[PDB]
Amino acid sequence: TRELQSLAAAVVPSAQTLKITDFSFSDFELSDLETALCTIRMFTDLNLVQNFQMKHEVLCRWILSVKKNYRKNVAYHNWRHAFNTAQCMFAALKAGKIQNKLTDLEILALLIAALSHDLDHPGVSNQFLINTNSELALMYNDESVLEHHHFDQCLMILNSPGNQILSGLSIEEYKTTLKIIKQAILATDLALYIKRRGEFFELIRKNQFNLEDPHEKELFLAMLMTACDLSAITKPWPIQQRIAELVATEFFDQGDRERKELNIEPTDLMNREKKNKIPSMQVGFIDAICLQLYEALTHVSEDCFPLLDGCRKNRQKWQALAE
Ligand SMILES: C=CCCOc1ncc(C(=C)O)cc1-c1nc2c(CC)[n+](C3CN(CC)C3)[nH]c2c(=O)[nH]1
Ligand SMILES: [Mg+2]
Numbered sequence: 001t002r003e004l005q006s007l008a009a010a011v012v013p014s015a016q017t018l019k020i021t022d023f024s025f026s027d028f029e030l031s032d033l034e035t036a037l038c039t040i041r042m043f044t045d046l047n048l049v050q051n052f053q054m055k056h057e058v059l060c061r062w063i064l065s066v067k068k069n070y071r072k073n074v075a076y077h078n079w080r081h082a083f084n085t086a087q088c089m090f091a092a093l094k095a096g097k098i099q100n101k102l103t104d105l106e107i108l109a110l111l112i113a114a115l116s117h118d119l120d121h122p123g124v125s126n127q128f129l130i131n132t133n134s135e136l137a138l139m140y141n142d143e144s145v146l147e148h149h150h151f152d153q154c155l156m157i158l159n160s161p162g163n164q165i166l167s168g169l170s171i172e173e174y175k176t177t178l179k180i181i182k183q184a185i186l187a188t189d190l191a192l193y194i195k196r197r198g199e200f201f202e203l204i205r206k207n208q209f210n211l212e213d214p215h216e217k218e219l220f221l222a223m224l225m226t227a228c229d230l231s232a233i234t235k236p237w238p239i240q241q242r243i244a245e246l247v248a249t250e251f252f253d254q255g256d257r258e259r260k261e262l263n264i265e266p267t268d269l270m271n272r273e274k275k276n277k278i279p280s281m282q283v284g285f286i287d288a289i290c291l292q293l294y295e296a297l298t299h300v301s302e303d304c305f306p307l308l309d310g311c312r313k314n315r316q317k318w319q320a321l322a323e
């Protein structure tokens with residue numbers, strides 16, 4: 001406790017004051033308490049609190065439980081990454097004007113999913129867990145191993161006493177919401193993004209994309225989750241540089257684990273000894289994974305252009321270092 005009393009008693013600053021509507025938002029100068037306040041404001045301004053009768057104390061407790069469940073010493077996949085993913089979701093819904101295209105339940109599910117999508121992340125990839133015979137990999141048949149675990153943790157917190165922010169939903173709304181949350185969290189497995197994005201891009205290319213279609217709406221929500229998950233790649237250069245260092249720290253740590261536990265030379269992405277490959281790998285990552293997604297998102301909502309624009313600027317920055 002303690003931290004809970006401080007959070008629950010604090011006056012929640014406006015979204016304007018907190019700057020959470022800005023796509024260029026930076027969490028670096030914020031304390032943990034400030035990120036928690038930002039999170040309460042996200043729920044509030046997305047019309048989720050009174051809408052679903054959330055008690056202030058319960059929401060505060062839930063937010064703190066989510067924050068605690070991240071491993072602070074994991075370099076990139078920690079609370080700050082989850083918080084930034086949620087902030088990008090808020091900005092996309094607000095400044096990006098996606099909010100009015102979705103239902104209240106979809107919004108509720110997306111914010112919860114964004115905040116919970118990496119819960120208890122071990123700092124190693126699905127491939128690593130599979131190669132080291134993780135019990136997690138066995139239980140989930142090597143499919144989206146981490147993501148199934150993140151969802152498991154998400155449910156655990158949602159059901160923990162004093163943290164039930166969904167206790168006010170009707171039976172049918174609860175059922176609908178949990179299904180969207182699971183799909184949203186699983187969507188953050190880049191393997192599923194690569195597997196399903198082809199369909200999304202094709203629908204748009206052939207002018208067949210229709211949000212009114214249940215299946216396409218679900219496909220869009222998955223893509224939106226990926227767009228928010230990768231959002232650091234759209235941030236102003238100083239921010240992208242700093243976060244890229246965190247990503248490298250985490251990947252190189254896994255590389256160390258691979259040399260010791262698997263007796264193998266890690267791929268460049270996880271090889272500290274070849275860190276000189278970072279600029280070129282970043283450009284390739286932006287081209288193959290990022291640009292098409294932000295281009296597609298902007299097509300759906302022009303107001304999301306800032307994400308694409310920021311991504312393009314970072315490609316230029318990384319390319320200048322690579323050439
Ligand atoms: C060594 C690390 C260098 C820094 O790396 C980064 N820094 C920041 C971000 C971000 C979202 O801002 C992202 C990265 C970053 N992430 C990468 C990932 C995981 C999604 N992959 C795998 C391999 N590919 C197969 C298709 C998917 N390659 C990446 C890369 O080159 N860069
Ligand atoms: Mg993840």
Ligand SMILES: [Zn+2]
Pocket residue numbers: 081085117118188229
């Ligand atoms: Zn993530």
